[PDB]
Amino acid sequence: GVDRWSKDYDVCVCHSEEDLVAAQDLVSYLEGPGGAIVSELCQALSSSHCRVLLITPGFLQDPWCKYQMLQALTEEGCTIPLLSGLSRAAYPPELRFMYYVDGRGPDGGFRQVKEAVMRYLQTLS
Template structure:
């Protein structure tokens, strides 16, 4: 009798706790399921976090590098490029400041790496505007003229344009970028130059400006190397 009683008690415990273990086994898959209800969201994140971390690590390894991870063009590390303080002098009317700053931000982005001069940002306080302007023009490899209806009505912009033309006439250094201006309305001095159209596709136009600057730096850097090599041979 005593053995039967003890056996009954043991059977009851097995039945009771075996059922709880089965219930837990049924809950566990729910914790890791994507269709799990919101009531289990906290438990799900704590249970699945190791596999999630592993997945994130795999994703970061297999993902392609972003544009900013790409190395800068080698010409940006050349001695010729380093000979001047700025890569691009940006000339624009005050009414077009937003457009000029947007283009400058693109050129100066870490993935592009250019150095730009903006008068409102880079002209030192207390400096004579004409003196600082002339210095910036002379200390820049290329000159970007943001040609808009505001530009052609602004005597100060036209003065800057003539300063640029006097420094490098008929050269790749002058980059006219046109917005809302037909060629027939461009200043006469610029109609013989190729222009960048920022009307149809702004992003493509920005890229054209960037490539034009790089091409000039590359051409002049190679020319300087050839000249130095010739002098060494001589």
């Protein structure tokens, strides 16, 4: 129902400082009549339809990352946790009850992440 053009970006990737390269790859992977997916790294003032949480060891050890995760789940919305480089036993327990993409999927999860984003965009006017 929400207008696709009401935000400038379709998706941004929220990531810890030590996962920059990986985040960049995902951005690139997402960039490749509803047009291409407009993508960027999440920044303090980023406004996008979808937000990918690149949940890694680095992400888990930064309290601020955890806080950002909380802010992403306050909205109907589009938050896509991607679990990368972690034992499932160490996944955030909340995710036992939530949607997420396992990094052990195709293209390190990227594929499914992309699909999720596309799904969400198809619900936009």
